[PDB]
Structure formats: C-alpha cells, structure tokens
Amino acid sequence: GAPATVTEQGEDITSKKDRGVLKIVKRVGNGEETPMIGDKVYVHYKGKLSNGKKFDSSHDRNEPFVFSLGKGQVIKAWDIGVATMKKGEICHLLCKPEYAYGSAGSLPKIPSNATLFFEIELLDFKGE
Ligand SMILES: C=CC[C@H](C(=O)N1CCCC[C@H]1C(=O)O[C@H](CCc1ccc(OC)c(OC)c1)c1cccc(OCC(=O)O)c1)c1cc(OC)c(OC)c(OC)c1
Ligand code: NA
DSSP: OOOHHHHHHHEEOOSOOSEEEEEEEEOOSSOOOOOOOTTTEEEEEEETTTTOOOOOTTSSSSEEEEETTTTSSSSSHHHGGGGOEEEEOOOEEEEEETTTTTTTTTTTTTTTTOOOEEEEEEEEOOOO
C-alpha cells in the first residue's frame, strides 16, 4: 500500500540522510515557492500509525489545520516535510519515531517507537 510505496520509492528529506522522513509527491502543486520558517501554513491531512491503527481524520477536508512552520508546533517530520511542499501539493510522508514521538510516545494514543504515515495537502501559506 501507500506506506510501502514510500519505503521503496520515497525520497529521504532528512539532514542526516537517516531515512527518518521519507516523501512521495502524489499531486504536484503550483509554482515554485515553498514555505519559510515562520510562515503560517494551512493544511488538510489524514494519518495513521504505519500499521493502520489510530487513524486521524480530524482535518481531512473540513476545517484547515493551521500552524507556524519551523517553530516546533508539530512533530519534527512535519516541520521538515511541509517545508518542502508547494501550494496545492499532496504528499505521502513516512515518519520514524526520532522525527515523531520517539521512545516516549504520546500514550495512550501513540505507542513508544511508532512510525507514522500521513497524506498531506498544502492549501496555502502566508508570511508572518
Ligand atoms: C496519526 C497521527 C496522530 C496526530 C499527529 O501525530 N499529528 C497531527 C498532525 C500534525 C502532525 C502530528 C503532530 O504534530 O501532532 C501534534 C501533537 C502535539 C505536539 C506538538 C509538538 C510537539 O513537538 C514539537 C509534540 O511533542 C509531543 C506534540 C499536534 C496535534 C494537533 C495540532 C497541532 O498543531 C496545530 C494546532 O495546535 O492547531 C499539533 C495527532 C493528532 C491529534 O489531534 C488531531 C493529536 O492530539 C490529540 C495528537 O496528539 C499526539 C496527534
Ligand atoms: Na491563524
């Protein structure tokens, strides 16, 4: 399925090249610009534990998910991965625990050492 495809074909967008954040573009966006640290980003997404459990549809097409990029308002994998997106782009993002909740997890929802998968659509972004 989609997580396996990102394992096999995904691009490693980590600084360390440790495969901790793997990406596939599923729909190409518009233009060339991608958001800078401090930009406000507006997203629709859905995600899960990579093994299918704990599905999150809270922002799948209803109210946008909003945060300021590169400020640690989200897990590291998102500050890294949403930064690479164009407006209108949809990507698949596979996130190892060191870029997500680590060995701590976020119990009971996220277990210790969990890999996460997201389908993310960047709707817009704007300067601070
Ligand atoms: C299948 C994945 C679960 C998903 C998740 O991991 N997400 C949500 C979508 C963005 C990526 C990731 C996330 O970053 O979630 C945070 C959790 C809180 C948080 C933020 C920063 C952290 O480190 C810098 C961190 O370490 C523990 C914990 C999140 C959830 C909801 C919103 C949010 O930001 C936008 C906002 O506050 O509106 C951010 C999620 C979704 C949640 O609510 C929809 C969560 O709150 C109950 C949640 O808590 C752990 C986790
Ligand atoms: Na806002």
